[PDB]
Design a protein around this ligand. Sequence first.
Ligand SMILES: Nc1ncnc2c1ncn2[C@@H]1O[C@H](COP(=O)(O)OP(=O)(O)O)[C@@H](O)[C@H]1O
Ligand SMILES: Nc1ncnc2c1ncn2[C@@H]1O[C@H](COP(=O)(O)OP(=O)(O)O)[C@@H](O)[C@H]1O
Lengths: 260, 734, 516
Amino acid sequence: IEIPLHQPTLFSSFGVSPPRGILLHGPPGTGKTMLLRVVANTSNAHVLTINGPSIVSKYLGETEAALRDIFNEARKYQPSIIFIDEIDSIAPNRANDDSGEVESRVVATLLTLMDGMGAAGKVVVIAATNRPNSVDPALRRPGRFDQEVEIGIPDVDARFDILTKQFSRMSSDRHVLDSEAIKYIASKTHGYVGADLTALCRESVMKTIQRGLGTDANIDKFSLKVTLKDVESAMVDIRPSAMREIFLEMPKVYWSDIGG
Amino acid sequence: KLPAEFITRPHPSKDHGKETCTAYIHPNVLSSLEINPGSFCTVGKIGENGILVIARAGDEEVHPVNVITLSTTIRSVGNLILGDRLELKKAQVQPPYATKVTVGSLQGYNILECMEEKVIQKLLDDSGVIMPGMIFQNLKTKAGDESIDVVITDASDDSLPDVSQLDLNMDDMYGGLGSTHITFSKETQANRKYNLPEPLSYAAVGGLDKEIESLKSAIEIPLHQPTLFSSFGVSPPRGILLHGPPGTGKTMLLRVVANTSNAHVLTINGPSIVSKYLGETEAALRDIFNEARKYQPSIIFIDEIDSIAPNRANDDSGEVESRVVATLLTLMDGMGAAGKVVVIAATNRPNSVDPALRRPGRFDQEVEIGIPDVDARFDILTKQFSRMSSDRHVLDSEAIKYIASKTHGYVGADLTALCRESVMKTIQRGLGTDANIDKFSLKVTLKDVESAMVDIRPSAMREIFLEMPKVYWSDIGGQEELKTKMKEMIQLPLEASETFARLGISAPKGVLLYGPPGCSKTLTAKALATESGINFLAVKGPEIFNKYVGESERAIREIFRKARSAAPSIIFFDEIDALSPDRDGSSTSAANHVLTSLLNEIDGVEELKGVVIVAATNRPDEIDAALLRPGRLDRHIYVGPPDVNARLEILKKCTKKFNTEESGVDLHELADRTEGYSGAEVVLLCQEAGLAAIMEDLDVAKVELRHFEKAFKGIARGITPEMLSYYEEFALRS
Amino acid sequence: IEIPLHQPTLFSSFGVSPPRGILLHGPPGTGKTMLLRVVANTSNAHVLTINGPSIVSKYLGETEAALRDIFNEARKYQPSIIFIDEIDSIAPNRANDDSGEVESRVVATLLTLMDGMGAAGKVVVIAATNRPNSVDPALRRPGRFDQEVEIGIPDVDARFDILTKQFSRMSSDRHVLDSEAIKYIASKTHGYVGADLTALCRESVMKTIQRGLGTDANIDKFSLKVTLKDVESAMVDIRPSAMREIFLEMPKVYWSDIGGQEELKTKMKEMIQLPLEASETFARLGISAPKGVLLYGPPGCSKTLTAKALATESGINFLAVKGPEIFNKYVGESERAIREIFRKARSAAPSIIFFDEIDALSPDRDGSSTSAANHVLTSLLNEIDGVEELKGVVIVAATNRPDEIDAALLRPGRLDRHIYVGPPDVNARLEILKKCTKKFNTEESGVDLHELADRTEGYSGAEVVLLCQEAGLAAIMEDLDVAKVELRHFEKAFKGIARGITPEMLSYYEEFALRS
Ligand SMILES: Nc1ncnc2c1ncn2[C@@H]1O[C@H](COP(=O)(O)OP(=O)(O)O)[C@@H](O)[C@H]1O
Ligand SMILES: Nc1ncnc2c1ncn2[C@@H]1O[C@H](COP(=O)(O)OP(=O)(O)O)[C@@H](O)[C@H]1O
């Protein structure tokens, strides 16, 4: 996001032209829009976002006119950011189904608009999809969308870091928990996704609320705070759903445990 | 009236006139814009703010409202091809003045001095002058004829509004028949900081020549010399199909041929013409046809015609379907008698195209655009790098050839993407390492290119035909008998087709290779593709197999027609003992259908004298006796295990990295002990010995004999006399 | 087309009324549009043509009103002719596809309008379709379109005629082509449609233009004109479209080419001479014709090119249909193809239908086969002699393995004749070797063509041809072109090649012949 925008003259000196596409893909809980929000909040450049189905209209030319208008508006302001969410639904695979209406017409017009806005400029288009297979292979071409980044499920290290950052928001004043308990929870959490970790946090907060209520008749929440037991209850009653995975991060084991 | 968009038109009568600010607009349009004609006008071309502010004049009511004339100079500067829609808007405020003004003298060595004779007066005598970009004809200046064009990019004028597309300037002269502090300075090309559109030229396209001259002829014959063809009375063709794998630059070729052609060009946006009521599309297409025919020279482009005109039997969705196909074929068939009109259709796959379109009456001309070869990729790389210039990269010819040799499965778009992400990698390696150092010194190297190819992840690996890597006879270790025989059966066809025709012998066009699966079969196939240098199509056994019934039939038909239409060549099968065995393996009906189709292709009511069919098998008796019929696949080569000489040569080649003198190996005792092994076995033994040597004390300059002998203990022979006797008895019975 | 228009009263006097619908069908590019255009040009009476899909509109009543107005205009002017283009698209099959909207409703209104538009009048309706099968059966009923015109792919004579006519339009000034070149082109172009020939001529002119521009540097195009050099590359790069067809005709091959046994030749000559000049004798006697001859023998020769020899000698159109090519992935497509070929054979005068192989479709019990093969075999059995008996056509079957034909097909009354057609004898092999060595010089080589045949007894005719081919290759690989092939090369090739035929299969064939 920084190379093609912050220094457009340096890249245009080569004349190879900068890429005009960033692809975010992976399973849910990968912080796709979160990344979109982060860059938009951080970068002072103008940002444009689409609502998805709201742009979709029954008329044949209304979508084309809206896309042209938003692209011309982005080109008018030199610092511009383009947001394209649920691109897979917006641009379904041509071979998978010939649904019609919102179909290859909009794909062709959008690729034409993002292929020739100018010589160098500074324009970036970010597309987020749930699955790259369902994405139209015309979209998944090196001519238009050569640059992609892969986002996967967090590992033991990454999952532990996410849990620690989430807890660090409530802070010690809210709860008391050592790093050993956090590491144990991260090791226990294997098939969960990024959103699943926040689901566990909310379920633990719930379980704490009802336990405190039914135990001490609406006592102050600060005394009970957050402990382990409600966390394990949340893991038991959370019904994990992202267990299926192409690759499995089996818990590690050292040579000390090895008998051979 | 209320005209929203206008179509460009070349300025006629040449001469001088005004030549920069003609703008022969209808007086009604002049009054509708609420601006006096004696002022600036603007042309849009669907966007591109600034809108190309150019002064305006009036016509003689002959010029219709739809078309507008704005001179070939501005047409080229704005890269305005014919048929595009131009928007009219109000004029912009007058720019202050011009500062430097500098000529470039393109496609020339400059330093003309005497030949100049005050070109400044001729250049600046014209009104308008959109400072950064003009081109002019050489005209008639003194003696020495020839032609030159100038580049007027260089300037040092600053304009507050950046909305203007090309920030035009004003003029102030002092002379008859002195600028601002001279104008002649250097022969620089178009400046990059202006970000002006680049006019496509044929020098950018590489590796596509052999059919580009045919395309040039097929476009030039009707549009430029139609009287000669009309005198014959066979009527001029109107349609040419371009097809091939994606990423071959079909659209770029169409754009460059449109830019080079000075006649009217018409293009469509693709499927967006599709609308409701089933009448708007018909009205639009008939309007496009009427516009193309109204002006005597015209060219029509059709893009992704497969989506517009899918196969009728394939799908029956409705709406825009075979009805529009019928109306367009009727329009094209009887649009004119002689005329000068050509329609070009671009499709990703010809099979999906409606067979009605693929008819001699409409699209009798077919152009094959395949993946670039080694030579084409070499030229494509040299071409981008030559344009790239050595000021931004340091890589010699051998590095380019080495990269091109490594790149096999890529396509034209893949190379450009690889270069772009190589630039990305170079920028990253500069910034993140040297903390924002000057990028001029580091520039482009080989390591970043190699890493870029490692991380490119190409998506064009699956191909119907594969260009298997070449290898010269020096690296080949084998028996002289098989090499001489193969040289004989490749020398007979190419330089003895006429002898066969005179004598009636023709060619067997069938050679069967059977042997041990250790080595020599594919190695002999390689020598044959490098040595002769003739077209080679590597076809593997399991890869033609498809789960869908009939897809393999289409694949084999396509490869056979490609071989037939791609000059004399050789067809090699890596493993033929997979499709052949059906009675023993109880194969499905698909295998039997494939066998029957290939038999009918090789020796059914047809003869393929140009191409030679060769096959390699591991188990020869499993091939059905129908294939082993006289007249087809008659040649048989034992090509068994390599002899002592071939194994010795292979060992010497593999040991070249190590030092034999320090180790003391005589390169003869090792070969004497290594008799029952194969070439692949010898290579594996050498690799294991090298691994054992390098795991002792890290890097070693030689491999020891003890390591080789330990590898000899640690490996199995892998060959059994029973299968050798099986091969021998198959040879005897044949 | 002349009997309803010029003389309507003569036909109406009978009271049966003249037909109004003429159907033109055939492969694409045959020239149905040419017939439409030429009848439009040569006729001085009013005609009406349709725009096809243009009449089709969103409104259901708009098409009906347009058709009614067209018919009213046609009937108002007493001499009228109706032209229909692509009737299949306008009138698809109800059974195949229920598209809806603009569909067989228009078929019903069209048939209603055209059944009682007039009593005598002078009106004829010409409809051209690409494929007759897709046309709905309502239009394909003798009530409206009983008269049909079949326009198949041009044969060698028709191709020669069109090339002679095609060249005349270009004229001798534009191209120097003689009769021999035209005949050679017609012989080479076997499976080509009429459109393909004109396209080949046009791109031959194109190749001439490129050659002239490349070589002569923009010389006058009339000097180079048209020769056979560009025509060769024309056949090379024409990219034909009529390769897949069931009307493949082998090139004519005379008796001198085939060296075989006189007994088999006499037998097949008698078999072909019985029907053509003894149909009346069969009718008087009631014997009729066996209409079935079985060709079983070793996978050598004399059982496949004998069909070509028969076609050349008799001068009768033959149906050279390969075995495996009738098999199709789609279920029932083979039945459609075989029924179409039977209809064409019946419609194309008394002819002879030859099968390249039958040992693949026939086996259903000995080897595992799909139900489609059994259905096709049952259909063939019902067609050959089941309830329906065909007189003019004669069916001959050639097989490479005899036991694969089931007893249901091998039933008395059909395919009764059996021919051993074994390996060629001494005289046949000697004649084949003499023909093969005709190009070479036997006197210089010193061979008498008799000892070679004496040594070459266990081989076949095709085996002998391959032996001569490889012997010539061995003769020429030494010093390029040679004027003769030596005996040493002959004997070296004799070591190099093997017959590949075992006595066990000959004994099996003899055993099968004994039981028949
Ligand atoms: N020096 C080498 N380096 C890398 N690959 C090689 C080398 N020599 C041969 N090969 C590969 O090994 C293969 C040998 O095939 P081969 O075993 O002869 O086929 P078959 O099993 O049918 O006999 C060839 O396809 C070739 O690509
Ligand atoms: N003397 C000859 N010269 C050239 N070709 C021949 C000669 N004799 C036979 N042939 C060819 O050999 C083929 C023999 O076919 P055959 O192998 O009997 O069919 P199948 O494989 O069904 O048994 C014929 O198609 C014929 O064209």
